[PDB]
Amino acid sequence: EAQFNILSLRENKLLGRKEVLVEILHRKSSTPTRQSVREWLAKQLGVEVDKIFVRKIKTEYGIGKSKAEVHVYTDGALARVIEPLYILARNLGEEGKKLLEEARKRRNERREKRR
Amino acid sequence: VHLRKSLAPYWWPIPRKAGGVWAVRPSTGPHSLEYSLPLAVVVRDVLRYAKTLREARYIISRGYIKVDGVVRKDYKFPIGLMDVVEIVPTGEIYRVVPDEAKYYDLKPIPSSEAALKPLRVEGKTAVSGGRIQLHFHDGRNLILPPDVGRQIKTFDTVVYDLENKAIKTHLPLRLGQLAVVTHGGNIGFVGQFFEVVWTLKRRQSVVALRKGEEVRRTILDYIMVIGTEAPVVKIS
Amino acid sequence: GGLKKPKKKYLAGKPKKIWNKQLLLEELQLMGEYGLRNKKELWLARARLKWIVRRARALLSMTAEERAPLEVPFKEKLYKMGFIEDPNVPLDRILSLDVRAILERRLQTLVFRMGLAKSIHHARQLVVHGHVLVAGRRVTSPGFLVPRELEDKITIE
RNA sequence: AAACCGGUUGAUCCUGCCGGACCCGACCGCUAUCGGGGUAGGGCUAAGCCAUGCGAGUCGCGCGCCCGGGGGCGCCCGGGAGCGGCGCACGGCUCAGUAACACGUGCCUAACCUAACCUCGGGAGGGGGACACCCCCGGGAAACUGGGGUCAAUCCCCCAUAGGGGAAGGGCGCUGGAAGGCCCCUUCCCCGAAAGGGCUGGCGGCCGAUCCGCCGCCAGUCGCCCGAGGGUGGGGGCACGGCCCAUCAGGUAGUUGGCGGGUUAAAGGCCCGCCAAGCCGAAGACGGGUAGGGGCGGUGAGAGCCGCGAGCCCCGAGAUGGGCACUGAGACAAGGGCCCAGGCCCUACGGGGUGCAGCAGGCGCGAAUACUCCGCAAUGCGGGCAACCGCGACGGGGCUACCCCGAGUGCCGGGCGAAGAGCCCGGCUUUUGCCCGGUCUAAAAAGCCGGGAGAAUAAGCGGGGGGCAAGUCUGGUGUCAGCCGCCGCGGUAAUACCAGCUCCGCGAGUGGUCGGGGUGUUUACUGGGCUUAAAGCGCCCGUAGCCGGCCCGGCAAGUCGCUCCUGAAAUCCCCGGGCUCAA
Ligand SMILES: [Mg+2]
Ligand SMILES: [Mg+2]
Ligand SMILES: [Mg+2]
Ligand SMILES: [Mg+2]
Ligand SMILES: [Mg+2]
Ligand SMILES: [Mg+2]
Ligand SMILES: [Mg+2]
Ligand SMILES: [Mg+2]
Ligand SMILES: [Mg+2]
Ligand SMILES: [Mg+2]
Ligand SMILES: [Mg+2]
Ligand SMILES: [Mg+2]
Ligand SMILES: [Mg+2]
Ligand SMILES: [Mg+2]
Ligand SMILES: [Mg+2]
Ligand SMILES: [Mg+2]
Ligand SMILES: [Mg+2]
Ligand SMILES: [Mg+2]
Ligand SMILES: [Mg+2]
Ligand SMILES: [Mg+2]
Ligand SMILES: [Mg+2]
Ligand SMILES: [Mg+2]
Ligand SMILES: [Mg+2]
Ligand SMILES: [Mg+2]
Ligand SMILES: [Mg+2]
Ligand SMILES: [Mg+2]
Ligand SMILES: [Mg+2]
Ligand SMILES: [Mg+2]
Ligand SMILES: [Mg+2]
Ligand SMILES: [Mg+2]
Ligand SMILES: [Mg+2]
């Protein structure tokens, strides 16, 4: 159904994060939710879900296997300053949506000014 | 200024087709444009610490990377032959040494060795006060008194202390010393300087290095003496 | 001033005089035997065969010293693909290869020859609809050239 | 696959031309379900004309002011109009000019400049000024713009020193292949730096809530000035290489050279004063024609031929035609300036603006053509300490028979049918199409995973006399209508026209016309021919060119072998790997 495993885990001390690559095996089943991948990784690593960010879940052709690229951060402030706004919007839920909306408002401003 | 990816140097460790149409252009610093790699390219494609130019520029702007004893916060800083690269939060120290396969590679070196740089003398000039300015292979200069400047010739090597701004040792270009090819085709070969044909132009003289029975030839401009039978600094 | 664009890969297999009755008969026989969609598939197989044969001719024309670092890997690759059965045959025997050897390596042909389908067209339908698994993954291209190591890893759903 | 076939004869062997068959590019007709990969699309047509929108900003850690919230120490946060720095000379377009040091390869500048960045050595002292925004008034249709007041600077200027240049003389010394160069000494003349500015923390002092600063020191940090080298960009020079025509044979007069100067960052008839007659040309001047050059592309078994030498990358030139300048390190500057020409738009008649060869878009021309769409998430660049900001570059989709790749338009058994098509019967499957979820995406779309019903939603184009695969089957017409790349049919019994039936070739393609290659040993180096088929000048002398006896000795230029520096990347061939294989 959904067999998850830590395929690999690199540690980038420069960005203060760990980049985990996870293997997901789901035969005859849909692609796993990125929320489910984050919950499994949080439970596996003993960390809060907010500290874990998914970059991309790519599913093979012709088989229910998916590889997920996940970032785990030592603190939420550096996580939100490093990860892209669309990534935070995908992962954090509503706070990423709020960040994207505020960015869009601040871009509409100064464009009206440039007009 | 822009650098089209087609006009990027061929030895650079980047794909030639898959990617954008631009490449990070080195910012006119202490090397040659075609014999150096920008710091962002080193961070993103050589060490794989950053996944994008934004992340690489963040890492560089924090001051985590040190080149030749000085923190470099410019993402376009050129990195070239024999440069010491130091990562601060991790403690890892590399030397940019000539390589047979990648043509230029970051090889880890000891912390005691990290403060020394073997610089090939590229020329001498007479400057004010009667002093001698030595110009090295990466554009660095050193002003010395005339008596010490008299006995150092072009194509010699000096092991130079970055922290003291002094010449730790001088390795003159003599037959039988150990030399490394720092340029074209026969790059990275280490061997004994055992044969020379002195052309009229000294820079274009034909030099032959030997590694047991392995004989390679280059021009005199393309070799650097790294000492006698044992190299002074870890290059391999 | 010229910009490179891709060219058809089956041109080397396609004949220049299509209106020969003998050539039409043999091509029709091959097409009906292996259940090919159109003449383009047969000509692609012939182009593959022509590449193999001309590689053999070129390696024969090179000297012994030049041929030495290429002769053994070439036959090894042909054996691994399944076009040649003995990887240690002489090089000039490779010159006499036949397009039926290449046509046997099609996934539809292998599905029919393993008895997984009632007919070659039913094997093509199986591969198209996705009921053929190659080592666990669905391979939906009937024209896929299965290698020797992957030949035994063919299953049905 | 290193290929032939049809045609001139009553028949035969030749010559030799034309056609057929293949690939590629452009346009066009009929038809067209899906997906993937890719740097396809007003080039081949007027560098023809344009409505509209967008297309270079960034910096408060350079500077003063104003506004709003907060708080007491010395300000914190946010915003505004600006001055000021840096950038806008990169990036984007297109192909008129150009047969040229434009371009390519190989070398130079010892004849030169270069902001930003790197390194080494040294320096940062004294003093002064103005102009914005703003306030009080405006003027003008608009564009734009006037007067007074007033606060600043990394804004502007002077002074000092450092330093720099010119002339001349001398020298151990440096570089370098070689000094007209560098350094040292000597003399005079001349020019002539700097922002210790910002921030952080600490210390001390002056000062006041009408202040929230100013000053002196220290450390850190980003900065400023001089000298030298590098880096980058640029200017300039050299050798060689790549079109047609003689129904173009003489051309040139600052033209060729020398000498002395001016200008330039720098050499040069670059320009100027004098002096000489030189310079180019049949090894093709000059003249005309065509054309941006290269990487490269199509075709052929190859030599070769062609340019589809449009798209992609590098160099060049241009911004309606022709000129000339400002600023600046850099322009004589596509979305900056000035003038002539030639258009056009607004106006309040006094004035102002404007030329899409930028991304969309409109008209025109033509055989011939895309959305007035989305994002700065990737690739980079300018600015910034940074965070970040901007970018019609770039990225993404749209449209379009752009090129390549993979598939569908069912499978199985039975019957009728002919063994065919098709129909019916029984079973199977769901690629595909349709609906839903996850994933994916900057967000979408698509893709992938999974779920639902269902045979169900999906084949055309050309042809059947020979070449050349496919009908002497049927009807109609009757040298008419029509076919016909060539040979040839049709004038009553048409296998060739018009239709039916049927078969053939390729197939999401299949045809028409063009251009290139093959064809073609019809351009012949490989490799043709000249008695009669086209082709020996009516004959001879001879210049350039090409071709040239034997032996010995020297060289090593051609030649051959090895090696090095190179011939950007992409493209091409081989090998390994990763996309489901494939591309
Ligand atoms: Mg006859
Ligand atoms: Mg045009
Ligand atoms: Mg600052
Ligand atoms: Mg402001
Ligand atoms: Mg440009
Ligand atoms: Mg200044
Ligand atoms: Mg001087
Ligand atoms: Mg002064
Ligand atoms: Mg001042
Ligand atoms: Mg002069
Ligand atoms: Mg002249
Ligand atoms: Mg041929
Ligand atoms: Mg274009
Ligand atoms: Mg003009
Ligand atoms: Mg202009
Ligand atoms: Mg125009
Ligand atoms: Mg346009
Ligand atoms: Mg971006
Ligand atoms: Mg296809
Ligand atoms: Mg029957
Ligand atoms: Mg979707
Ligand atoms: Mg038809
Ligand atoms: Mg008929
Ligand atoms: Mg026939
Ligand atoms: Mg006919
Ligand atoms: Mg002939
Ligand atoms: Mg005759
Ligand atoms: Mg005669
Ligand atoms: Mg005559
Ligand atoms: Mg006569
Ligand atoms: Mg020779």
Swiss-Prot record, chain B:
SMART domains associated with the record: S4
Q: Name one GO biological process term.
A: translation
Single GO molecular function: structural constituent of ribosome
Query: By its UniProt entry, which CDD domains does this protein fall under?
Result: S4
- For whether the record's keyword set contains Ribosomal protein, the answer is yes
Coiled coil ranges: none
Q: Which PROSITE patterns match?
A: S4
Instruction: Name the UniProt key words of this record, in alphabetical order.
Output: Ribonucleoprotein, Ribosomal protein, RNA-binding, rRNA-binding
Q: Where is the S4 RNA-binding domain?
A: 37-109
Gene Ontology annotations for the cellular component aspect, listed alphabetically: cytosolic small ribosomal subunit
* Taxonomy, superkingdom: Archaea
Family note = Belongs to the eukaryotic ribosomal protein eS4 family.
Protein name (database record)? Small ribosomal subunit protein eS4
Which species is this record about?
Pyrobaculum calidifontis (strain DSM 21063 / JCM 11548 / VA1)
Task: Supply the gene name.
Answer: rps4e
UniProtKB/Swiss-Prot annotation, chain C:
Query: What InterPro entries does this protein map onto?
Result: Ribosomal_uS4, Ribosomal_uS4_arc, Ribosomal_uS4_CS, Ribosomal_uS4_euk/arc, Ribosomal_uS4_N, S4_RNA-bd, S4_RNA-bd_sf
Q: Which GO terms describe its molecular function?
A: rRNA binding; structural constituent of ribosome
What's any one GO cellular component for it? small ribosomal subunit
Where does the source fall among the domains of life? Answer: Archaea
Q: Name one Pfam family in it.
A: S4
S4 RNA-binding domain mapped to chain residues = 105-157
The alphabetized list of GO BP terms reads: ribosomal small subunit biogenesis; translation
Record's keyword annotation contains Plastid: no
Which keywords has UniProt assigned to this entry?
Ribonucleoprotein, Ribosomal protein, RNA-binding, rRNA-binding
Q: Which family does it belong to?
A: Belongs to the universal ribosomal protein uS4 family.
* Chain's role: One of the primary rRNA binding proteins, it binds directly to 16S rRNA where it nucleates assembly of the body of the 30S subunit. With S5 and S12 plays an important role in translational accuracy.
Q: By its UniProt entry, which HAMAP family does this protein fall under?
A: Ribosomal_uS4_A
Q: Its quaternary structure?
A: Part of the 30S ribosomal subunit. Contacts protein S5. The interaction surface between S4 and S5 is involved in control of translational fidelity.
What is the protein named?
A: Small ribosomal subunit protein uS4
Lineage of this protein's species?
A: Archaea, Thermoproteota, Thermoprotei, Thermoproteales, Thermoproteaceae
